[PDB]
A paper describes a structure:
Hexameric MCM rings act as the replicative DNA helicase, encircling the leading strand DNA template at the replication fork. Each Mcm subunit contains three domains. The N-terminal domain (MCMN) possesses an OB (oligonucleotide/oligosaccharide binding)-fold and usually a zinc-binding motif.
Like SsoMCMN, PfMCMN elutes as a monomer by size-exclusion chromatography (data not shown) but adopts a hexameric arrangement in the crystal structure. The RMSD of the C-subdomain Cα-positions from the sixfold permutation is 3.03 Å and 1.45 Å for hexamers 1 and 2, respectively. In contrast, PfMCMN without DNA bound is highly symmetric and shows minimal RMSD from sixfold symmetry, indicating that DNA induces asymmetry in the MCM ring.
Residue numbers in the entry:
A (entry chain A), B (entry chain F), C (entry chain E), D (entry chain D), E (entry chain C), F (entry chain B): 0 to 254
Write the structure that this text describes.
Amino acid sequence: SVDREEMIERFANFLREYTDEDGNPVYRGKITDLLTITPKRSVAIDWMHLNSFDSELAHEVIENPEEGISAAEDAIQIVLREDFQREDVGKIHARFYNLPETLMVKDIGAEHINKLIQVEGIVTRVGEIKPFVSVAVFVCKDCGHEMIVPQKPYESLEKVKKCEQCGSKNIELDVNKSSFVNFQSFRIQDRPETLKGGEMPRFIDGILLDDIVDVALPGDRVIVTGILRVVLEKREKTPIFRKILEVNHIEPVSK
Amino acid sequence: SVDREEMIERFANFLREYTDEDGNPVYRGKITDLLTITPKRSVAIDWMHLNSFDSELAHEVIENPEEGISAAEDAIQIVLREDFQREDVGKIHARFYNLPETLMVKDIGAEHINKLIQVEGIVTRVGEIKPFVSVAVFVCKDCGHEMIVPQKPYESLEKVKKCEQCGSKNIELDVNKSSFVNFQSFRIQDRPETLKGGEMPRFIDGILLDDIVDVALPGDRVIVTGILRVVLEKREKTPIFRKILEVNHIEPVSK
Amino acid sequence: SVDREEMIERFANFLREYTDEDGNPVYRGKITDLLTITPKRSVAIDWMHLNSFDSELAHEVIENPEEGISAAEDAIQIVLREDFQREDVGKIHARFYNLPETLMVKDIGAEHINKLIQVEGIVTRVGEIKPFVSVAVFVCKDCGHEMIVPQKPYESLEKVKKCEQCGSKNIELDVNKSSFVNFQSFRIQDRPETLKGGEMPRFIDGILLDDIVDVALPGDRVIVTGILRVVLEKREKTPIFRKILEVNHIEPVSK
Amino acid sequence: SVDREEMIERFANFLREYTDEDGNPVYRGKITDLLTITPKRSVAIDWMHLNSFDSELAHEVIENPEEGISAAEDAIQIVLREDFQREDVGKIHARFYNLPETLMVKDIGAEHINKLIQVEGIVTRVGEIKPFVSVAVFVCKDCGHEMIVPQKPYESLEKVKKCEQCGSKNIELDVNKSSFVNFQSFRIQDRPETLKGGEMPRFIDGILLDDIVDVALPGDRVIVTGILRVVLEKREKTPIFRKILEVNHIEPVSK
Amino acid sequence: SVDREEMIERFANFLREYTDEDGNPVYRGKITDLLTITPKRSVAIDWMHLNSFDSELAHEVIENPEEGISAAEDAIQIVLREDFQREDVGKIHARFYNLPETLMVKDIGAEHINKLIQVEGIVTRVGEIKPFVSVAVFVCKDCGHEMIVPQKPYESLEKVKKCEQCGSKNIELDVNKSSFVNFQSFRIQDRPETLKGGEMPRFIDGILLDDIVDVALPGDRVIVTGILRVVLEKREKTPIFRKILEVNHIEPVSK
Amino acid sequence: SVDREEMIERFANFLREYTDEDGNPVYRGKITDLLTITPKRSVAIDWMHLNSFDSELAHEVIENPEEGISAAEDAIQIVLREDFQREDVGKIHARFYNLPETLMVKDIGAEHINKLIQVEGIVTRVGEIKPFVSVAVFVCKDCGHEMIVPQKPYESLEKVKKCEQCGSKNIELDVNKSSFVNFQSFRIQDRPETLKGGEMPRFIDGILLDDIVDVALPGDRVIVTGILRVVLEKREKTPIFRKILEVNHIEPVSK
Ligand SMILES: [Zn+2]
Ligand SMILES: [Zn+2]
Ligand SMILES: [Zn+2]
Ligand SMILES: [Zn+2]
Ligand SMILES: [Zn+2]
Ligand SMILES: [Zn+2]
């Protein structure tokens, strides 16, 4: 594998040095679009650009999308600070698109768990848009100590009943110090055009966070990139799992 | 930010010194209307008046509506005592209206949590009117000690199983010493006129207390000001939240 | 307020000394009607009579109906013993009627909790008639000690898991030593004649005990007097309350 | 009241000495009918006979039907042993009929709890016939000790988690040593002939044990004697009760 | 009663010595039919044969069917070993038929609990055929000790949370060492021919094990012999019971 | 029985030495087909081939399919390493087909528990395809120790609340180190052609793992081989069991 520390360096270097056919550093341009009047909160990164620049790294985001995306996001922060003199910008997402192989909902299985995959499909359902705690801060009601606990949208809420410093059992979730972002579920199934003869469309539930929330409604067909995540079924006692697609990138397709 | 102590002083000074086009101190007049035969229990404050008089403070009520409204209410109490020789008047509400930006139900999201927002919409549902304990007094059944515990209409009831003085586990809610006000839920969604082409109306549940209860019924379109509050969903184990609008001001709009 | 001890003295003196236009002590007469063949178990008291005789006390029953009615009932017991030579008569109810202001079901709110109110309305529902334990006696299955615990018809049953004398956890409810009276729920809402133009009738659930049970059925319009009581909603975790009218006096009205 | 010990003596003396118009000791005859080929398991006792012979005792069965019926049943056992030389006969029921006042289902209330009452009515429902443990024997799975615990058909099952001798928590219900009798529920309501003008028939659930099980079906109108018993409603937390009629005697009436 | 030890001796002697009209020992013949190519797993025993040979014992199987059937089955095992030189044969059932009195479903009651009864009726329902653990073997996951716990098809599963030897709480049900047989429920009610004039057919649920499973379907009228067993109703807190017929012998009847 | 150690040796020798009519070692060929471009993850083994080569072993897979299949799979791994110089190949399934006796769904019973059986039938239902943890790895959140716990698709998930090394109660399921395969339920019942005259089709639920998942849909008639497994019914307190067929081999049949 590729070191975390090192992976960032190669991502920084990719952003600032990759050029298209005419020599324009495209990622410089994109990183610039984070600074305008009505800015963007994320950088869409074309996998093919990355693969042509550093294919070893390109493969490591599909194999380890977690440390990969995190590395890229740190890198974006670096070039902002070093090259644009901007430190006080928020979380900026790294959103990879246009992956080598694009598979169908029916093709998704155990061999994808924790790996970035591209999926074509059609949106069947969309949730209402609720707040998610991306980072919860628990404050000790007694000694006043603060504890930072990042959360995961597909997992359950990780509380902490005991104070890490004084050890009192009087703790609460501090909504002001905590970090919320918009959250939205959606369902996506295989497109009935690519199927049948008497076949059954399979589906997959997925989640959308922050800036990519609300991009789609029922009927829209889409290409989405994401991580395939598993979580045990309701009862929490069967060795069988429920699969959710933590979306990293969406875009419509003109039918 | 602005100090609590200081924030009150600026609010007092705003109430007694702000004048309209002709020089009538309007808030003096309003504070006066608390003392008539069939009095009012609140002072509607026009944000624009405030902004023109002290814009730093005006912005601090939208950013910190909790300490802001509380400050204003204390100030009302001060001018009553100092300028009208009235101390025995009850809780008088500070109700801010006419905010700079007025957003739609569909626009409400994580970025509004704990911030005063203005919302235009249409009332879909209204609850029946129940008593709420705005302040509960728990009395020790054993040593007879009294404990004051203010409540929040959107949160759950905060009991106290242990006596703060003698430490006995025999305590009850004393309905006479406790403070009740009327409570009423309502639902408000985006107005179908400002939507569609095939779009879905989003909604938000909201709460009404004391003097503003029962001001509206299903069908009425309204402009409401309030705080966007979050509370975890039923199960209390998912890091996803339910959003409620603790209303600070309502008024109809003649359709 | 008025002392409990003293309040009784003034009620005794009201019963035996108040006379109508011709000088007949009406309450002497009423107290007498408790002693006939098919006696009554309560004395209806006309508020106006009381107000004209002792208005300070008359106001204290509307403000403190609990200690007020209780005081009056003790007084009845006194005149029975002192003036009729009767000690072995049961609980005799004090039932106040004809109060100064008579409000509607829609007018009932937080500002009435624990205060005697008069309400006009129409009966929508009536419960089946069940036994209520007005006074429960718990007996220790071990040391045989007896403990008296008066109950409230709108509250839940107050048990006692521990023996007050020997401290054994083997206790039961002794049905023979305990005191039961008939109990009956009913619903009353605003009369559709005093409403609408497109308005919604509000309702209130209420309870009837002992001699006043079974006085009314669905369709009958009535004027009832009673105490407005609150109790938390099902879950027992929301600071919102359910309101029940513990009836102190009912009478039909010929429509 | 009348002593238990003594009450038996007067019952024995009633059975063997009471004579009708011609001098036949009727209860001797009845007690004799317990000994034939297809015997009876109970003695029907005509209240009027008893009242004319010993009215003090006759009133004590209506006031204390529990110790009264029990006394009578012990007495039957005495005359069997002393006068018929029969000891090995089973439980023989004392079943009182023809009481002074016969009231209607709608008349039944809190003033009857634990008192023998006569009721006329019509059977609406009958249960299927299940076994009831009239006496449960619990055996210690460890030290083999036996404990006798009589049960009540309207109450719940009284277990015993702890051994009275060795104190082990390994105990079970021994079906062989335990005593079972047939049990059958039924519903009886006021007869529609004795009602209306727009009136609602009230009902009461009742239970039948052993030899009187299966005596009636839906449609049959009956006069039943029995004890009015109370037991708390489902939740077991409201001071309101459910009333059941533990039947002591039934007989049809030719409509 | 009759001793267990002794009871077996008389059963052995019955099997090998009872002869019909011509002197053929019929039970020798039957015991022989356990040894053929497609053998039987039970010996039907005609009660009348037994009664004529040893009526004291014949009555003890109707009074104590549990120790009686068990005794007979041990005896079959004895003659197999002693007279046929066969030890490795499985559990062979003793299935009694043709009892003196044959009663109807509606006649079955508390006076039959734990006694072999014959019943005529018609099959209304039959369960699907599931495996039952006739003998469960629990193995200690820690010290590897094995514990044998015979089960009852009408009772619940008797686990054992603690190891009888080392006392560890890590135990599981070992499916390989445990003994399973086929199980099948059925319902049988009184035949509508032997009823009515406006009468209601009563029913009884029953169970079938091992070789007698699947012998009947809905519509078939049958004569079954079995034990009447009781078990408490769902809640497990009312002293009322549910009755099930543990079938010991079935046979069709040509309608 | 046959030793585990030894059983493998005989299986290795069967794979590499068994030849058909022309002398081609068929299993060499099959093991070869695991190595191509789009390889297979299992070796279908024809029972008849095995029976003709080593019938003692052939019978031991039907009697002990668990240790049998496991032995065969180890053997496949041996020939791969020793004869193909391949060690890094995954789990490869041993899938036995064409057994001596092929029985019907209605014929399946307690006498098959834990034995490989062949079943003909028709597919009625098929589950959606979920991930199953074939091997769970639990990691200690405290001392970082790893524990391997193989799971069973028909059983429940076997957690481990205590750390095997440090003994901390802070443990979680590590999805990355854990092993997942696709899982799919299906229902199969007797074919209506081989039945009736007024007969009822019986059914059996079954499970498919890994490479054999998704091979069939409702309507397809099939011959499947598998293990008959039992597991207690929902409540987990009745000695009755639910039967599931852990499929070891499927194939369609052209109707
Ligand atoms: Zn702390
Ligand atoms: Zn205290
Ligand atoms: Zn005690
Ligand atoms: Zn014991
Ligand atoms: Zn052990
Ligand atoms: Zn550890």
